[PDB]
Amino acid sequence: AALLQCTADTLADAVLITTAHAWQHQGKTLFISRKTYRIDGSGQMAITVDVEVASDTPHPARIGLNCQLAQVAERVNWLGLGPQENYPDRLTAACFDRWDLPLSDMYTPYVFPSENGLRCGTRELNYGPHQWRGDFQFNISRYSQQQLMETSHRHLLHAEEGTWLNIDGFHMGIGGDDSWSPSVSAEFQLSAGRYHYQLVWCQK
Amino acid sequence: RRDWENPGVTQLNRLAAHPPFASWRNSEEARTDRPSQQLRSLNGEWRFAWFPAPEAVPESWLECDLPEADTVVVPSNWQMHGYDAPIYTNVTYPITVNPPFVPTENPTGCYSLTFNVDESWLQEGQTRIIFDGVNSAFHLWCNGRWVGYGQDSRLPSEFDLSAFLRAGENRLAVMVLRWSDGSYLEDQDMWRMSGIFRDVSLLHKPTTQISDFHVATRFNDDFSRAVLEAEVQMCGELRDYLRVTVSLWQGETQVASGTAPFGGEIIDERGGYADRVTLRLNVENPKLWSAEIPNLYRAVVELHTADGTLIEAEACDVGFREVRIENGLLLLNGKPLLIRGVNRHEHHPLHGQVMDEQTMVQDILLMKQNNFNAVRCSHYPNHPLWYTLCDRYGLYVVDEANIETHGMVPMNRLTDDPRWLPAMSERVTRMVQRDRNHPSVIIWSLGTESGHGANHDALYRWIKSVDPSRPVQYEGGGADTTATDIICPMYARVDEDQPFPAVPKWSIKKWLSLPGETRPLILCEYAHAMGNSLGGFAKYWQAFRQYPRLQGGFVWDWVDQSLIKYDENGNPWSAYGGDFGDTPNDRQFCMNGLVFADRTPHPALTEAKHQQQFFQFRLSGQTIEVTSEYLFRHSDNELLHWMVALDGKPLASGEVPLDVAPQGKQLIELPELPQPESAGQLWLTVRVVQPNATAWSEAGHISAWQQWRLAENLSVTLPAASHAIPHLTTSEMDFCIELGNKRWQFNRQSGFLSQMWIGDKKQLLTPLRDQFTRAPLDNDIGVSEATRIDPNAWVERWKAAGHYQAEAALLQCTADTLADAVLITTAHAWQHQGKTLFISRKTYRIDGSGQMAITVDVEVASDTPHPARIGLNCQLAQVAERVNWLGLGPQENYPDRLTAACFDRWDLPLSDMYTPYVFPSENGLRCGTRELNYGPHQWRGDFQFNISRYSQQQLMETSHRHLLHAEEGTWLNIDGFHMGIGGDDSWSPSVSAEFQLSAGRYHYQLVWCQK
Ligand SMILES: O=C1O[C@H](CO)[C@H](O)[C@H](O)[C@H]1O
Ligand SMILES: [Mg+2]
Ligand SMILES: [Mg+2]
Ligand SMILES: [Mg+2]
Ligand code: NA
Ligand code: NA
Ligand code: NA
């Protein structure tokens, strides 16, 4: 990530932070992320994200944000599709409702570790004192994406400090028509070029 | 005898049907198709008188010209001369349904002609009169004596006048009835007119004559050898010295010839036809006929004496081709066809249903120029010249019998009734007898919309028995009955089923594999082109190409059936149903064409041309793969032009000759491309150009094109921020932004940008507000009948939900000062009687560079019908001459109809950004636009837009385009999103799910600034 902009303005009843980053690889600008963070007097932080994706770079696996929370709570409560793991091209079975599960159930123990536990069509997520609102996809666990891709067997994974949260505005399909050739259908590939999503982070 | 109210009497004393005759008495004239002294035209000025009913016609008219009669031009429709009104009704019969009776008040057209006949014509031989088309029935008199009667408005009626004529002056008396029992079989969706609308002529034949002749061509497996079989029939006295010679010519070279006396082979216990003979000619390596290469030979049929004296000669153009269905595929010369067809009615805005060569040629040229290779004679046999033109220019033809009983209840009430079998059979058998020698005709049709009756099965078999060389199709009763060799549905969709009881319209892909089904499927009607339409056209062609047995279809239809009327100043305007006081009527439903009545193209025509292209392309790295969809010809008049441009700026281009065999592929390796400096998206555009002119196109004609996004370099270098800082002025009623001498005014009561100033000049006539509606397209209204409303139509759903009445409610309006700009935030709720339809949240950021960045996020209640659009609109004070934009164009294009449009820098006059659809509606949109320039304004982003002097309000309030008036300033509609236009049909919701704005939440951003 290469910082292009980072400003801060004081508004009538809030503080507005504006940023812009570009992800490059060997001189090639892969992505551009432009965000605004609006923190008002109610304590709510409204995050607006607009991403540009080079039309000639392979369509990205996801477009979101991530961070490792210091908090490690027993339960995860969300208003969205569930209760089980569901992805854009595999969510017909999931139902929209208020779900509450122990953190462990938010992780799918695939023998060969990979991205897992995602939940789509979520308007509200609650973890510890945190609450995220909007229209997003998310997965939450004690395992970072990095560890998952570097680990070959599930019994070799180790809970990291805190809880890793991945909040996606958009997420690519998982496919499966076969597992030895690209099988994600065009309609589930992130090829729009420009993406937008907004999230509100606050304490409950 | 009221013969016009008896389906049993379809004619009296009418001669047998037959192929086009000219009775040449010179073999050379026959070969070269020169005019014949024996075939005289009686077209020109005639005497005409209109009467309310046949009982009102004075008997003195049979022998003397009526002093009150007028002198009019024939052929013509008397409605076009104003004697009575033409009627436009779709399904409902124009007369009370009470077969076989018609109204006692039956408009009667009394035509009469005084002409000269030379004695030489009456001293020997036979003199017949030929009426190519009389609508709908008539009685004929000659010099006061009754000759005969005839029905079927679309086929010639011939009568022998040999014993009625006298040397010198003669007078014809023709009483044409507008309505007859024949009208029950002519319920086509078109203007209901009448009169002597096709040519009238006199033909002299020797007593001993050629009375009929059939030409057939069969081949071996590889078409390297053919046999031309010609059966010839004669009338008159048989003599042993009589002979028939059939010669086949290619240009001026005779390639084959055969001679023989009359006397066919033994056929049954009673012998054979002593008055017929069949000649068989062997042809090696014949040049084959196709729409691709319309090779034609000439066959001359000579009746003569053994010692060489010619009696008479007849002839026809011969196209060597085989049509057959094998293993579920329609094949022409052994190859599976892909029908790029269209339905075509014989219509002229001024002359009505009278056809002329110039209009016919114009249509064929436009059709071929727009990649059509086939036409359906919807829904009757056409003017005879039409087939001659199709044979020569090269178009596959579906010849259709003049039978449609759409208004009956049920639809097959007459066609299943043996009492109507005779009337129906003549409409079928006489068509075949007339056009069976035309190579362009490859399929026979039993008519249209008459349900499925036993009469159809009988006639289907009659054709199969009489002419095995052509498949027979018929859509009535479910499109796949036992009376059709081809599954020929009307408006069946690609993926979606329409399970109507009894006659469901299955997705065409699903239809092909229904248990036990094996026939090919070719839609006889699809992509209803009414008004702003043809949305989803590309979906049909992707399917046609992927599925072998989906062999195309015929678009409905070619030309708007609008008619010309004039205002008080003599200015002509396009009229439709009801504009002539005709009622009941189905208003604008008569206009469903790809081109306007004057043949000016509708935007949809370019979409058809592109999807029907004969060359397909694929790109891999720097290699272009060109695939030919031609079946017989090599690309010997094609060159590929390619060009790369960065945001409209030419970077590199070149040409490469195309040398692709039919169905073959050619790989073209593009040179090294100099990576551009500035950021932006590189676009590759290829076009196939025909360097040499053809019989149907001018040199340089573009027949195909395609575009691809190449490399893209995102702009990361932030622009040098200006030094100026916008200023915010706050009052109780407004938030005013000031930069230099520029001002932006936001009303605090309404929450909208109400005005903008460039010094002392105002920029808006109306505030900039959100818009979620569009003046309804014909597809939005969805009605095939003027009297039948519909709560399911998109327009009715939008109206009922209060979309057109939605009032904006300000929820918030704030202003904040930033380090280098002023930020305006607003939120509005659009509601209808307590129900919130949409919520719009916006932010306007004006910086020191004078740029106003507008961010718009909209919420759409899930339970409200999906909106027609999601954008903003305003009436600009300015009126500029040109419109310049970087986006899809140059022509009008919508989300489900923009594959033909190309991304580039376009620049047109304001007038061209408005499409003059006779029935006004939302129009002129251009999608995928990144920059728009008009006057001192420039909008940037990624939107769709239309700009004109007509507000959406006037458009939806006006029924005719000539009634539109330019408004002050210019109306601009900038949409972040716009709903598909649809068109699979225009009488039920047809916009596909993926083109409906159902996401619930939308986001789009625009930058407005001066230039
Ligand atoms: O099914 C049909 O649809 C068209 C609607 O314009 C027109 O009425 C055609 O003649 C008819 O065959
Ligand atoms: Mg009759
Ligand atoms: Mg009809
Ligand atoms: Mg001519
Ligand atoms: Na792994
Ligand atoms: Na096909
Ligand atoms: Na119509």
Ligand code: NA
């Ligand atoms: Na060529």
Ligand code: NA
């Ligand atoms: Na209108």
